[PDB]
């Protein structure tokens, strides 16, 4: 299920993303 | 079951900055 | 009174670390009413079990109050019920009886033990981490001065000292919510290990009464 | 700020994998506990199936349509009666051979199903004893760079070395932050299967039981 | 003294509650010490003794004659003792039910045994859990008001406030202080307990086999 | 099989700093 | 050089103390348990060797009852297991699996003990290893108060009456990182190595039971 | 390696200790992954011969001459086969204990190898558990050497200092990053060292499985 890894690296670095830009945000 | 002394740490950071200020 | 002025993530995470208190304290009176009664409920229980009195009449003492049944009396109730289950549906092996009632026994252990504790790892959670979220929360605070200190240079004597103690609040805040957590959280794990022994000699009991003297009837 | 462009390049790149090793720990995260979850719920969701009092025989008939996308449960219950009948058609003579073989099927049916189910859980593991020593390291090389950088100028001023400073304090604040998660659901996630290891060996303990008292009958 | 008497009511209360933790972890120290000694000499003899080529009712018999006194595995010898002869006065439970109702005889004493063996056990763990925590609580706070109080004043570059975070880092210190010896208690005598109640499992399931044994010749 | 991090290494560093910052 | 107990404090003189004395027990229980734990080791392969040499367990029983004091090993285990399991078998014992179980208690008894035996001084140094790098840091904190509270009385430091506490702070570490720093190399080590006799041990119990099973059994 | 060309008295010794570690873990790791993984082929190789219509004598005498070179499961299956073979045709005690001595032949053989290839495996684990606290050990001298070095009592130009603190961190920066790679490798072997055992074992409970049929008869 690679895929499967793959979409869930996905969505980790979405969540990530837009956590670093509230960080920025916010700053 | 073990000593947890993570908190200390951000003391010891508030103590840097008392000195170069 | 300083949970007006500080930066909106610093508000946040004094929000959520209020809010781990308030669930942690909640938690704490809920599980240790609630773990209280069950021990009541059980040693009851076992005080009126070994009264000589014969399985079938207590099982059907406690066919009246089904809906409102819980504790070790559960353990038996459920049980009782597979062992009828396959009783009356002469289809079985002897030696398989046993062992299906010590399957929906184990089952019903396993259901009564989840929902007697639920928020326990939730507590054991917040002790790990209420300390780091204080970390974040006056680190982001340290680093704020820095950037409040870079717009003039006087060597900042005087007036970074507030910066310094509105993002120190922070970790006091998370390390006073991760006392209590810490401290109950092997309090009310170590009462649950033991409910869990108190039910698994229940059943191992009820396993080893079936085998002998309740097959025949 | 964003602190990188005035950040050294060692430190750049510090930061750099340690966001990546966040984000490979957070997509393993995801992905083995919904995977766990899934296993779980189908745990109980066919042993009682395997209890409610269908014929064994006859469940194996419905099976050896889903030859591979067989899961946990339904995996080892297939391999086992696949094995006890193979032994017992081709020997038919067998005193107590077959519960033994039927066993050795389910233990390596399991620990291949275990083995493959935590599939990178011992990585987790692996960027917690870790994560604080790379973030150690790069603020250690930060100070002891702005140590070396004053040692040219006059009075030994120390607030002109402010930034250089806090930026090497700034290497454990993206630190030891990708450690903690990691540890916590490596704990969790192993106690986790460890319960299904203990689920699935009550299973043998049941089922080799079984084709005990079901040899002699045959 | 003079520094610990020195205004902040709340630090000189949590040095206190501090101090209260330290001298009970002290005393439990002790208190649990030589009566896990005392046990652990009583269960070797009573390991050594017990299979020595002597008769179970000149046993039973001895320890009859030296009742209201007993501690240690003796107990969940004579717990059960008492429960299988007094099941076993003719029309009564069976030759089979008479072992697991002397078990439970047996196994019931055995905990009760147990609890009275690890009394505050279950307190060095939280007190050492919590006792840096408490301290730090203590120093932060001392902290924050000898840095409000640095906001209104001019100048006093570290000349002031020193004191200050002095009085507030007492508070640690005395914290690890109580909480180091906790955590050591915490784990050799929970260990030795744990080996405690491992053992007294393991000689009642000797037992019963033993008294299964006089059963099936009586 | 490691499932414990390390706060030791982290302290010290920076309490050897602040002894520098002491001087 | 080192004359930093006389110029320090009373407490910081007690921690510096405690620390020493634990990094000399632990460097000592080292190399008086390695040393044991190797000799056990190597006598227990011995034994299993010669157990499975073909020789009948009469013989060797009878060769090894001779020195009954300063026996341990497997060797200890199978005489404990042996001499009583013939006793019962003299004495009655009708049963087979009464004589079986009371092989397999002694097996249990002398391995309970002769393990423990092995296993002596060792949980004392997994919890210096852990524990050493929390006094350290309590000694460091009291140098640091210690230092402060000098600090905050004139004007200017004066690098006189600040040296002693940073002096107390970094010996206090050094001495605790290096009573730590043997305790944490060789704990796992140690433990280990007793793991895997403990295996080792439980596989001769096994054999030997199914042995003694056979025996008994046959006749 | 300018800063390190005076050193001292004791911090020679330190980090040159360290190099020492990080060069050996380096040598111990790449050797370690390759007779890993050319170990592991053999056993898959071997497992596929094994599984095929050869009889047991056929590939007992096809591997006579190989001897020292013989390593892999296939070292194993001679072991056990020549235990039993000296058993069953010097035949002296019933035939359901040759077997036993035939399996304690393969653990033993077993035993072997996996010490074999757990060779230096414990001395990566111990480095990087041990490596930070040197390395800790070597800064905080070098900042009291530094300290104790300062000729005058006052020395109000102190701009020195710095090189001697660089000097003193790259101590704990050199033992970390010894660290950091042998405690990724520790866990990273241990876990293909841990799949070998497996399919160790499972190789032995199938040859003993299939060689105990075989035993009351030939």
Redesign the interface.
Known sequence: QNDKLKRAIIISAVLHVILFAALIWSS | SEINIVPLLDVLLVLLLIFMA | DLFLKA???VKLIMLILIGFSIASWAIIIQRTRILNAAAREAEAFEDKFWSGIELSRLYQESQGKRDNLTGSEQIFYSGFKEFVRLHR?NSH?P??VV??AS?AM??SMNRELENLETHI?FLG?VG??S??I???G??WG??????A??AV?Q????????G??E???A??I???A??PA???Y??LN?RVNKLELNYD?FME?FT??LH??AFTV
Not at chain 3, 142 to 147: D, G, L, Q, S
Not at chain 3, 155 to 162: E, N, R, W
Request: zero cysteines.
């Open positions: 930066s909106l993530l549906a092996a030696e398989a062992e299906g399957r184990r089952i790892p959670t790990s981490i300390p780091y204080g970390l974040f006056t680190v340290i680093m704020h001065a820095f950037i200190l870079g240079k060597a900042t004597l005087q007036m970074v000292a507030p310094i103690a993002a120190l609040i970790t006091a998370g390390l006073f991760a006392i810490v401290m109950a092997n309090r170590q000699n009991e080893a009464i002998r003297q």
